[PDB]
Structures are given as structure tokens and as C-alpha cells.
Write a structure and sequence with these properties.
The structure is cut from a larger assembly and holds two copies of chain A. By secondary structure, chain A is α/β, with parallel strands linked by helices. Chain A is built from 21 helices and ten strands. The first copy, chain A, has a five-stranded parallel sheet with strand order 2-3-4-1-5, sandwiched between helices. In chain A, strand 7, helix 14 and strand 8 form a beta-alpha-beta unit. In chain A, helix 8 packs across helix 9. Chain A is elongated and about 105 Å long. At the A-B interface, helix 10 of A face helix 2 of B. Bound molecules: adenosine-5'-triphosphate, adenosine-5'-diphosphate (2 copies) and magnesium ion (MG). The PDB classes it as hydrolase.
Chain lengths: 518, 107
């Protein structure tokens, strides 16, 4: 049978069936018929996927599903330690237990399963982007060389399938390869049922803990973090009884502890990090005119398009305007309004002092992470500061520009969706750098122009009384103004310190001294 | 419950209860119910802050509050010796005794 639910495995249902069919099948049917065909058994399996998705569990469970001996373990980088050749001889001795037993019993020996961890370090040894060549050659010779070995099996697992050299993934060597991905809602429900089983075996769980609700609450989780959530909930519930209540039977777990753990304890690695938005949207958003409404409507239309389209899986948009106009505070809100499971912000604030290579790796890593989820939204902040642009000569970095241009057109893999929002302050330079023909649409964020809008914004904020309002309006309505919102906040805060009598006057002075502009 | 003041520490009051509850509530409590719980015990803690705030003073007090063995010590810049392989030997030796104790007459 294929009962992968009673052994611990959860979401994995098709990978197991296919792997068992293709590899662990030649050794199940009667020996006589197999000998009559005389077909060589499979001698390699490869696994790849995001970390902590249930890889080692399957590897160790498969052996016990068969009948083999102690499964060995070897680390990837450790094999490429200070000494090689002696470690190659240690590899030879690692397989010698099966070697001697093989020649002693050619066709009547058991399975000698060896598991490889981080096979990328051992192999690969690229000359782009020495001592290890000896190890790769030795491993290739031992796995499939002049000598014939039949009673062994190699299972390798990694996180970067592309780095695997093409020499290994050829017939005879590791051939069957599988992907393990993040679970969907069904996988989450199955995993939660598996882990929360013993608890129901002793009436230690309250009746208000609905697994179905928890399944829909957690989005883009991993099995390890689900186990961590269960552990945290148990710990909180138990600590509730090592306190003012009874000191060292009336013990149960309540949904309140589960919700508290969700909101305070566990932070997913492929999820919406809520703590990051407190430092980019501080004073909220206030409707001082029509442009705010127009921009928000455009953003919502873009989100709706990308969510319900099949022929346009990639969409990008660029926000541009004069300096000090609130560009980074309207992009974050647009991203947050959508309920996309995966959201991230790549900003220069976290790359103070990097070289020109670290930036490319960081950007590629962010965009690589964004691909695993089935719905994403990534924000790039202050592109010009990202390119290190200074208008004397001028000077900038070519590598970052090329990486950005290439990345802004690569479609998402297979059947997923994406949305990229950019921010900038000097559109003409981007026009001359050819970037502007890579984005799909543009939006203009204007500044405050007329006195009425200034009056509306000042009233909505709220700092001046009726008399001061009328006094300010008397002068303001007689001319036209040009100033950004952030500067308005700064001027109000600076003015408010003065004594009540002079406040108005002071403010007026500032607006006259700085308001000189078209 | 714990009253920090008499243990030789004062001021690190709020940031004590969080760690206590999170990672040390399962090394107490009647073991029989814990057997059914099946929960495993945490095996890691990280502390960060400016120098000279009492980080070391907390470890030697947590050690003598759980009825444990004496604290082993290690340094970072020294274990990064030139000898590659002997550093692994030091790493092995570090756990040797605890590994041996778990191997025999454990639980
Ligand atoms: N309707 C609004 N639109 C934009 N910002 C607003 C609005 N209402 C209030 N604000 C506040 O204005 C500020 C806009 O963000 P911020 O000060 O970072 O400007 P910015 O455009 O990102 O600046 P820069 O591009 O020069 O770095 C935030 O404090 C935001 O709270
Ligand atoms: N599909 C799953 N079903 C049940 N438990 C899981 C599943 N995926 C992960 N886990 C839990 O999370 C842990 C993940 O560890 P593991 O997969 O061995 O890490 P890695 O894949 O990096 O070697 C396991 O110990 C297991 O208890
Ligand atoms: N909260 C505290 N209460 C009492 N003494 C403290 C506290 N924090 C630091 N100290 C004093 O600092 C001295 C050394 O602290 P130490 O453990 O070396 O800190 P660190 O290792 O972080 O520099 C001790 O003698 C101790 O008395
Ligand atoms: Mg900005």
C-alpha cells in the first residue's frame, strides 16, 4: 500500500507514488520474473525544494518502508575538508561494507542506503561567477565505473538544482529527480491533523480549537513552522498553570493561546512581515484632493488585473514626481491594500557600504525567493540611489543597471504571477538610460498648487483655530503656492514651537521664504 | 515564580519573564502530564545587546536555577584555528562528555 499518512508524511502524495513506481519497483515483484528480464535497478535519486519542507523525513521513511540496514549520513562541505584522498579512502570504506558483502553474495545481498546532504558543495566546482575535482572524479568512478556494484543506492538532496553539474544527471547515475514544494491548504490541514493527534488521545484539547479555521488563517507556511506553532501554543497553555493558579488535571489548550502565538511568537519566512510597514507609512494618508483618489484607483485596477488574468502574468508600474511629494508612502499602501500572501520591500537602507557585487546577489536572492509563492508583490525603492548616480560627469554602475533591466522582463516560472512597483525622482535620466521602455505604465504624483487645497489639508490635519484659519486664508487666496506635503508637515511642526501670539506670523514668513518656485 | 532581585540581577525584569515562559516552562511542571504532551525541549537561545549590560551574568544564574551541571566555556576567535580538522576535533571534544552521558543511563 501507499499509506503515506500513517508514517508522518503530509502533503506529499504524488512525489511518493512516482518515486516508488519508478525506482522502488524493480525489487518488489517475484525474483524469478525479474531475473528472466534481467533489468538493472535504479541507482540514484535527486530531491530539490525550499528548505524545511519535509525532505529528510521521506528519505528516512522510505528505507524503513523497505527492509535495509542502518542508513549512513555524510555532510556535503565536510567531505571537502583539509584532507582529500584519505577522505576519498574513507568514502571507499563507507561503501566497502556493501562492496565486500556484494562480492560475497552477488545476487543475495541487502540494500546499503547512503544519504547525501548538500551535494552541491561536493560536486559543481564551477569556473564562473581545484582540490574538489579529485573528489568529483572519484565519486563518479565509484558510483558507476569499471567495477559493477548492484546492492547500493544514493539519494541526494539540494536547494539549488541548477548548480548541479550535468555529468551526474545522466542514465545509470542519478536519473529520477523530484521537487518538493510548499503545501497548499490541504497539506496544512493534513499536517496539523498528524501533529495534533496525541493531544486528543487523552482529552487534553478543548472543543473550541477548530483545525479548519487555523488552516485558512496560516498562509504560505512550512511544516517546521507549523510544528513550532503547536509547540508555542502548548507552552503558553501550560505556563498559564505554573502561575497564580495551581502550583507545582484541569489542563486544556484554548484557541486564545493559538491566536496569541500566531500574532506574537512565530514569524513565517515566506509571508507578509507586518512589522516592516510601521516605518514607511507613519502618518497615514489624508484625502486632500482628487489626485490621491485617482492614484489609488489606478493601483487597485492594476492589482485586480494581475490577480484575474491568464495572458499577462507579469505587470509593472512606475511612480514618479517632484522631490518631497510622498512617493514611498503611496506605494507601500498600494502594496498593502492587496491581500497577496507574499510581500517584500528591497530598499537601499539595508545596503550601506556594500560593494557592487553584493547588491546584485541581494536583488537576485529577493527575486528568486519571490518566485516560490503563487502570488507576490515586490517594491523597489529609490532606483537612482540604487544605481549610485551623481550628475558630475556623470558616474554610475553598469552591473546593477544590466541586472535590473534583465530582471524586469523575466516572466515568472510555470504558472505563477507577479507585480513590481518602482519609485524614482528624476525621470529624464531614466529616459536616457533606456530603463523607462522596460516598465509598462507610468503614474504622476503632483504637488499642492492652489490655496483651497492648502486650506483643506491644514484643516484636516488640525493645528489652527478659526481665527488663524481666516487670517491665513486672507493672504493665501491672493496668490498660488507650490510645495510638497512633507515640507508642509515640517513647516507646521517648526512653527508650532513659537509662542501663541506669533505662531501665525512665523508660519507665514516661512511659507514666503521657501515658497519661491514655479 | 521568580523574584530576580535576590539572585544578583536587577533591571532586566521584563526581558526575563519572556525567556522564562517560552523556553523554560517545559523543564518544570509535573513530568507525567508532559509525557502525554510529547513536546520537546528547546535547545537554543540568542542574546544581543551593547557590551557591559549583564549578558554573561544571566547564563551562570540560569544554570544554577535548573539544577544543571557546571557551564562549559568556548571562544569564537580561538576555535577558528589554522588547523582545519583539529577544529573539528575540538568541536567533538566539546560535546564528548554529554554525548557519552546521553549514550548510557540516559533519559
Ligand atoms: N496623501 C498623502 N500622500 C503622501 N504622503 C502623505 C499623505 N498624507 C500624509 N503623508 C505623509 O507624507 C510623508 C510621505 O512620505 P515621505 O516623507 O517619506 O516622502 P517621500 O515621497 O517618500 O520622500 P523622498 O522621495 O524625498 O525620499 C509620510 O509622512 C506620509 O505619512
Ligand atoms: N509534510 C510534512 N509532514 C509532517 N511533518 C513535516 C512535514 N514537513 C516538515 N515536517 C516537520 O518539519 C521538520 C522538517 O525537517 P527536515 O524536512 O528534515 O529539514 P530539511 O528538509 O531541511 O532536512 C521535520 O522534522 C518534520 O517533523
Ligand atoms: N543587571 C545587573 N545587575 C547587577 N550587576 C550587573 C548588571 N549588569 C551588569 N552588572 C555588572 O557587570 C559586571 C560584569 O558584567 P559582564 O557579565 O562582564 O557583562 P558583559 O559580559 O555583557 O560585558 C558584573 O560584575 C556585574 O556586577
Ligand atoms: Mg523617497
Amino acid at each position: 500500500d501507499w499509506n503515506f499518512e500513517k508514517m508522518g508524511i503530509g502533503g506529499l502524495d504524488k512525489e511518493f507514488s512516482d518515486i516508488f513506481r519508478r525506482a522502488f519497483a524493480s525489487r518488489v515483484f517475484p525474483p524469478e520474473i525479474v531475473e528472466q528480464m534481467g533489468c538493472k535497478h535504479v541507482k540514484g535519486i535527486l530531491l530539490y525544494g525550499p528548505p524545511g519542507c519535509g525532505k529528510t523525513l521521506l528519505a528516512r521513511q522510505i528505507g524503513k518502508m523497505l527492509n535495509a540496514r542502518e542508513p549512513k549520513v555524510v555532510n556535503g562541505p565536510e567531505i571537502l575538508n583539509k584532507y582529500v584522498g584519505e577522505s576519498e579512502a574513507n568514502i571507499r570504506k563507507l561503501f566497502a561494507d556493501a562492496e565486500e558483502e556484494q562480492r560475497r553474495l552477488g545476487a543475495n545481498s541487502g540494500l546499503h542506503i547512503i544519504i547525501f546532504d548538500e551535494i552541491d558543495a561536493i560536486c559543481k566546482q564551477r569556473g564562473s561567477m581545484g582540490v574538489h575535482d579529485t573528489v568529483v572524479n572519484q565519486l563518479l568512478s565509484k558510483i558507476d565505473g569499471v567495477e559493477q556494484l548492484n546492492n547500493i543506492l544514493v539519494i541526494g538532496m539540494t536547494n539549488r538544482p541548477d548548480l548541479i553539474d550535468e555529468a551526474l544527471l545522466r542514465p545509470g547515475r542519478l536519473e529520477v529527480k523530484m521537487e518538493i514544494g510548499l503545501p497548499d491548504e490541504k497539506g496544512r490541514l493534513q499536517i496539523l491533523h498528524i501533529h495534533t493527534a496525541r493531544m486528543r488521545g487523552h482529552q487534553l484539547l478543548s472543543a473550541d480549537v477548530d483545525i479548519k479555521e487555523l488552516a485558512v488563517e496560516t498562509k504560505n507556511f512550512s511544516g517546521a513552522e507549523l510544528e513550532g506553532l503547536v509547540r508555542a501554543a502548548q507552552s503558553t497553555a501550560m505556563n498559564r498553570h505554573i502561575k497564580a493558579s495551581t502550583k507545582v488535571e484541569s489542563l486544556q489548550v484554548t484557541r486564545g493561546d493559538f491566536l496569541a502565538s500566531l500574532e506574537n511568537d512565530i514569524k513565517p519566512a515566506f509571508g507578509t512581515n507586518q512589522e516592516d510597514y510601521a516605518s514607511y507609512i507613519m502618518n497615514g494618508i489624508i484625502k486632500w484632493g482628487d489626485p490621491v483618489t485617482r492614484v489609488l484607483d489606478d493601483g487597485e485596477l492594476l492589482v485586480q488585473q494581475t490577480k484575474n488574468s491568464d495572458r499577462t502574468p507579469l505587470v509593472s508600474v512606475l511612480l514618479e514626481g517632484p522631490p518631497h511629494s510622498g512617493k514611498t508612502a503611496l506605494a507601500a499602501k498600494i502594496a498593502e491594500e492587496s491581500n497577496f500572501p507574499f510581500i517584500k520591500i528591497c530598499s537601499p537602507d539595508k545596503m550601506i557600504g556594500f560593494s557592487e557585487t553584493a547588491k546584485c546577489q541581494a536583488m537576485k536572492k529577493i527575486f528568486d525567493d519571490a518566485y516560490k509563492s503563487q502570488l507576490s508583490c515586490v517594491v523597489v525603492d529609490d532606483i537612482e540611489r540604487l544605481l549610485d548616480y551623481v550628475p558630475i560627469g556623470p558616474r554610475f554602475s553598469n552591473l546593477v543597471l544590466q541586472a535590473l533591466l534583465v530582471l524586469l522582463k523575466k516572466a515568472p516560472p510555470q504558472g505563477r504571477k507577479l507585480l513590481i512597483i518602482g519609485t524614482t525622482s528624476r525621470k529624464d535620466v531614466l529616459q536616457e538610460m533606456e530603463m523607462l521602455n522596460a516598465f509598462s505604465t507610468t503614474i504622476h504624483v503632483p504637488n499642492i498648487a492652489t490655496g483651497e487645497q492648502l486650506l483643506e489639508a491644514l484643516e484636516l490635519l488640525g493645528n489652527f483655530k478659526d481665527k488663524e484659519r481666516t487670517t491665513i486664508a486672507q493672504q493665501v487666496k491672493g496668490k498660488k503656492v507650490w510645495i510638497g506635503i512633507k515640507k508642509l508637515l515640517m513647516l507646521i511642526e517648526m512653527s508650532l514651537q513659537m509662542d501663541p501670539e506669533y505662531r501665525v506670523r512665523k508660519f507665514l514668513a516661512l511659507l514666503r521664504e521657501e515658497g519661491a518656485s514655479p
